[PDB]
Design a protein around this nucleic acid. Structure first.
Ligand SMILES: [Zn+2]
Ligand SMILES: [Zn+2]
Ligand SMILES: [Zn+2]
Length: 87
DNA sequence: AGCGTGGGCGT
DNA sequence: TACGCCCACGC
């Protein structure tokens, strides 16, 4: 089962790993340790900060295998690729 | 479309 | 524990 439960009285979510609960607590504490150097916006997660910066830089590492169109995030590419399916 | 952001991991 | 993938869900 999931032994790590959120100690917040209003929350009843559970987790299987320690660090996942630790990350979840930041939702309640509102902790946002990672800041964008460009627009000074704060983020709760380092990886989400990385993808956010691409909105400023215009970096798009992920290209569609079918047409070559580039995207800032991998899930953006995945959502796109399926449109080449014409049933 | 553009993108915030939590969840579920693997390392 | 932190780091950073994929993956979802949502607007
Ligand atoms: Zn909670
Ligand atoms: Zn920014
Ligand atoms: Zn394409």
């Amino acid at each position: 089962e999931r032994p790590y439960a959120c100690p917040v009285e209003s929350c009843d979510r559970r987790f299987s790993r320690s660090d996942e609960l630790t990350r979840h607590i930041r939702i309640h504490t509102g902790q946002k340790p990672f800041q964008c150097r460009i627009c000074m916006r704060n983020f709760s997660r380092s990886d989400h900060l990385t993808t956010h910066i691409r909105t400023h830089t215009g970096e798009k590492p992920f290209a569609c295998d079918i047409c070559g169109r580039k995207f800032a995030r991998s899930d953006e590419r995945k959502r796109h690729t399926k449109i080449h399916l014409r049933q």
